[PDB]
Amino acid sequence: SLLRQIPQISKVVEIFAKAYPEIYVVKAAREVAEKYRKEIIEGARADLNGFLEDVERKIKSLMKPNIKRVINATGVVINTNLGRAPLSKDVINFISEIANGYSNLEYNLEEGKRGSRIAHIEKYLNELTGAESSFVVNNNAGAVFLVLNTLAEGKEVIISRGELVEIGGSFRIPDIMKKSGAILREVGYYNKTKVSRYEGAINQNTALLMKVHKSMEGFVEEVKLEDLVKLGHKYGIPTYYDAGSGLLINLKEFGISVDEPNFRDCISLGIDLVSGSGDKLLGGPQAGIIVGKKNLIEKIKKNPIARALRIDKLTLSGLEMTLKLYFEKRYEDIPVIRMLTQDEKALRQKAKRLEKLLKDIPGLKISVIKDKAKPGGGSLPELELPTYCVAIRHDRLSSQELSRRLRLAEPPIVCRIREDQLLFDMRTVFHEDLKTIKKTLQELLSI
Amino acid sequence: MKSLLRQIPQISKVVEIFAKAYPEIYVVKAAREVAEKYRKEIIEGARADLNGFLEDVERKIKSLMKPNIKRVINATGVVINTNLGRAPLSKDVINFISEIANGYSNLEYNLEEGKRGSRIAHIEKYLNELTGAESSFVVNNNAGAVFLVLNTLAEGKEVIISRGELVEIGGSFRIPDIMKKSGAILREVGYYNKTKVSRYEGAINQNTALLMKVHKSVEEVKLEDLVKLGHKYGIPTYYDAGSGLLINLKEFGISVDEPNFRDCISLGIDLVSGSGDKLLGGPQAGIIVGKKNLIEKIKKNPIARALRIDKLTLSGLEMTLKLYFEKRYEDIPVIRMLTQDEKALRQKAKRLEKLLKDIPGLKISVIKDKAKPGGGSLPELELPTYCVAIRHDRLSSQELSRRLRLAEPPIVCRIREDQLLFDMRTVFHEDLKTIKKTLQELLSI
Known part of the structure; x- marks a missing residue:
């Protein structure tokens, strides 16, 4: 009852x-x-x-x-x-404007015909990084997958073993890399890595030389990027650096002196391709940004999976404004920069x-x-x-x-x-x- | 010339x-x-x-x-x-997105437990509700959905499909390109216009992971026969309907033949996917709904992380899904414009x-x-x-x-x-x- x-x-x-x-x-x-x-x-x-x-x-x-x-x-x-970087209302006003009705997203208004949506952004990235070309995907995890799967499917990628460990990428990145379609040739140890160990792993299947950004123990021997570029030229092998922070320019300019990879210096160093997160130190919306040599970027753009990683209108819109501010050096308008400065x-x-x-x-x-x-x-x-x-x-x-x-x-x-x-x-x-x-x-x- | x-x-x-x-x-x-x-x-x-x-x-x-x-x-x-960008968004939505965009939020945080949580948590319960599917997940776009479902369930295994679903000018062969690149081994059956049920069963073997159908804009087979068979042999069926249409259309006084999630799940398809920003008038999204053990598997595939949805599309997805529940169609630009x-x-x-x-x-x-x-x-x-x-x-x-x-x-x-x-x-x-x-x-x- x-x-x-x-x-x-x-x-x-x-x-x-x-x-x-x-x-x-x-x-x-x-x-x-x-x-x-x-x-x-x-x-x-x-x-x-x-x-x-x-x-x-x-x-x-x-x-x-x-x-x-x-x-x-x-x-x-x-x-x-808590959602990484928040956005200035300037950005959010741009996003809302475009979001509210139809737009020129995939249209070229001069030619009166369809166009790529990366056209809108591309030239900014090129400008700031100094890279031959650029492309933007859903997020940096997508970027990595796309870079490996495009350049090295079925072929080897040499990378240090120390870059298969992480608690902050929660092994989500290694797991993607392992699932990318490429054959990772791991070298060195967690703390132990010498340039020769890299060169020693170079072969008929070698497609790419990859470095990822590290995040503790007493000592870790690691290799100067210069040695990698050096190496990559020597053997005709593209070099890829996942920076991940998405830090666009050198930090020193805001009064923060730290060692951090920024796109502009990485490209000027001689890396072929660098990729980063749009919403970490860039203080933009979520994105995977990739910049570098055109022939590379071009190849990647044409990978079909790149349609599965294509950024939405909003993130694009928001990312253009974010980029427009960076060009006008309006860093006070970029929440993440504002708070760190x-x-x-x-x-x-x-x-x-x-x-x-x-x-x-x-x-x-x-x-x-x-x-x-x-x-x-x-x-x-x-x-x-x-x-x-x-x-x-x-x-x-x-x-x-x-x-x-x-x-x-x-x-x-x-x-x-x-x-x-x-x-x-x-x-x-x-x-x-x-x-x-x-x-x-x-x-x-x-x- | 140099002068x-x-x-x-x-x-x-x-x-x-x-x-x-x-x-x-x-x-x-x-x-x-x-x-x-x-x-x-x-x-x-x-x-x-x-x-x-x-x-x-x-x-x-x-x-x-x-x-x-x-x-x-x-x-x-x-x-x-x-x-022109497909579905625009109502200002109700935009204001929500914009509110969240402006400062920190509970995106990946469970405020109850005081620990980290999956951002899909937010949207999942409306999705299940509206479609009637056991579970639901959402990825970058429907392209990304298709890939993920296949790479998850059929990596190294066979997907049955009719050869007729390898030839599209409006998908510009972009879709079959993804499916090919997915890592699954497609087993094509019948011909372009020629398709019989037995031809689908005769293709079932110890490596069959999945039967799959894609939405056609000729003599084919009803889905009923496909789930019937899938059930027979224990093989998930997956239907990319893709329009992203949420409910039957007949309620708006438009009578067409077009797959909606709710009816496709009621028909017993094991998974159904679709573009968020087409007939759902939402933000760009790949929406996956259906049997739990499947979506569970999918959630856990590490590629899903590369296909994860950003903050804005998530938060815009919530507002859209909210309106759908409240049958506030007049506030969905696509539905409004079509009604x-x-x-x-x-x-x-x-x-x-x-x-x-x-x-x-x-x-x-x-x-x-x-x-x-x-x-x-x-x-x-x-x-x-x-x-x-x-x-x-x-x-x-x-x-x-x-x-x-x-x-x-x-x-x-x-x-x-x-x-x-x-x-x-x-x-x-x-x-x-x-x-x-x-x-x-x-x-x-």
């Missing part, structure tokens, strides 16, 4: 007339009905009062989109979980601005700390930049529970934990959000 | 000629681009003259400073127009013809015409529309539309017996002012 007591859908329809829409009601009822069937199936529940209540909560949740914006307090500029002093400032807003909250130990951080994500761990974070602690509540409620808030707030203290990194935080932090913080703690 | 080549001015001189005129950088880019073109044309001896030069360099600048991708006014009446009533079309044609009567030398007529608005994708589709025909005494339409496409904004329209035809179907009323404006702009000068 207990399970039959679960009310008919039609009856819950009655309950919510103009209360909510019928269709969203029925979706909520069914979902709960299934759950509440199952609770009593395992005999876990003796109660049918919560039927009505939780239905409503579904309805309450079914009517807000699954994707939602979020407040990043992690200080990781490139946050893979943020000054040490201006960061202390923002942390203190918040700290003042939180003394009026009970049970709270607010502290402000200077920390060296890695805002590149697990992608670019070589990148160390100082930041001021806002550390907090609550007596009654653990950070593990505190943050659990922060992320469960509207809006949600995401921040790193250190030793049962909630750190807010100011690097990733728009001044806008600060009020909404205090607001949402005290609201939770208020009940 | 004539030496006449080429150095870049620093061209920088002098445009001072505050234009930004230094855009002058130099335009000077380099042009200097190369001029060197080469002297080298092939095509040019004896340097006079057209500076004016040309300026034209570059004026063009280098504007985006290459620009909005275009579509009067072709082709709703799915592969040159547009005969009467409501004539009205728009008149509103424009009113606006153009004040312009001289213009023969303005309004006509009803039946058209093929599905694009070369869906040719079986004939629908009535009202167009605005025009003519100008001194100007041929070949020249007139040439001048239209070259306008800002550009305007693209189909020609009929030296009449420029503006099909209302693909025109947004916001354009009407800019049509009039740019029309007289050409003719007055």
Whole structure:
């Protein structure tokens, strides 16, 4: 007699007339009905009062989109979980304009006939990298696959074994390379690699000489790209470097001195092909960018799989604007550049601005700390930049529970934990959000 | 020739000629681009003259400073127009995408668990809901879908298929090229027009991984017979329907034969795939729905990562899928444009013809015409529309539309017996002012 007591859908329809829409009601009822069937199936529940209540909560949740914006307090500029680079509204205004109606995407308005959509971008990339040609695909994972599968299907690619390991590519890249159609001839060891070891692997099947970007142990011997180019010329073998960061120009120009491959220097070094991610250090939309020797790029363009990796209108549109800014050197308009160029002093400032807003909250130990951080994500761990974070602690509540409620808030707030203290990194935080932090913080703690 | 080549001015001189005129950088880019073109044309001896030069360099600048991708006014009446970008997006969608695009988000993060999550999670549940399939996945495009399904289920194994599905001019042999490149071993059956069920079974052996059918624009076999057989021997069936059509069409008062996901899954096909941005009026997408163990397999193939969808198309996919659920079809540009009533079309044609009567030398007529608005994708589709025909005494339409496409904004329209035809179907009323404006702009000068 207990399970039959679960009310008919039609009856819950009655309950919510103009209360909510019928269709969203029925979706909520069914979902709960299934759950509440199952609770009593395992005999876990003796109660049918919560039927009505939780239905409503579904309805309450079914009517807000699954994707939602979020407040990043992690200080990781490139946050893979939080969607990597965000976009200036300039870019987003361009994208929206094109997206809203028909366009010249695959049309050539001069000739009055069809055209490639990479025409729109190509010349920018060429300009900035100094590469003979360029092509853009869905993402850099696609790029790699496309480069190998195009140049070396059935033929060998020589690469060091150290570039088959990764926790940040989660072996997704190696696994693609292994699935690319090419025969990888691995050389050297994890830490051990000499140029000769490469040359020693050169043969009648050799198609390509490949280097990938590395991300720790005591020592690692590795080879200067110059030796690879040298080698590749010597034996008539194209050289490919997956940079992956997508870093367009040298960093030194923004006041950051690090060792990082940028397209322009890699091409000027003599690599035949370089490929990178559009949405990491380029701060653009998701893309795989490839630049280099024309004959190569040309071959790749003609691989049919390249139709399976063809970028959508939006990412293209967005990527043109992104590129137009880079040419006009408007780096302040490129979110990821803006945040990384943020000054040490201006960061202390923002942390203190918040700290003042939180003394009026009970049970709270607010502290402000200077920390060296890695805002590149697990992608670019070589990148160390100082930041001021806002550390907090609550007596009654653990950070593990505190943050659990922060992320469960509207809006949600995401921040790193250190030793049962909630750190807010100011690097990733728009001044806008600060009020909404205090607001949402005290609201939770208020009940 | 080298005296004539030496006449080429150095870049620093061209920088002098445009001072505050234009930004230094855009002058130099335009000077380099042009200097190369001029060197080469002297080298092939095509040019004896340097006079057209500076004016040309300026034209570059004026063009280098504007985006290459620009909005275009579509009067072709082709709703799915592969040159004009296919399905446009409603502003409801665009605003969502734009909101997310602007800052950080819960894309790959599960806010509940406080750990990383698959971005498909967001969209999966609407997809299953609408189609009725056990699970669903989404990749870059339908091309990418096809490849992935094959490379996943049939790498090194045999896919059965009719030879008839190796010969397309509208897929430009691009599709069978992908399938060939997929890593699967296709086993073709029957002939171009010749296909019997037994011929499909006789091709089943210990290496058969999959039976597959693709959507045909002749004597073939119904799918019913294919699932029946697939089931018999334990062989998944996969149907690339490709239009990306979400539900039966009959609900919009259009009665055609066209595969939709929901009906194809109800028919028991094990997997069905389709283009997000064709009849679904969504963003570019490869949509895969069907049996769980299959989509599970597929999700786990490492190539799927290279085929992964970006943020914007994902977030635009959610908004679109939301509207579909709420049957807010009027907010899906493709559906809206295709459901547009005969009467409501004539009205728009008149509103424009009113606006153009004040312009001289213009023969303005309004006509009803039946058209093929599905694009070369869906040719079986004939629908009535009202167009605005025009003519100008001194100007041929070949020249007139040439001048239209070259306008800002550009305007693209189909020609009929030296009449420029503006099909209302693909025109947004916001354009009407800019049509009039740019029309007289050409003719007055």
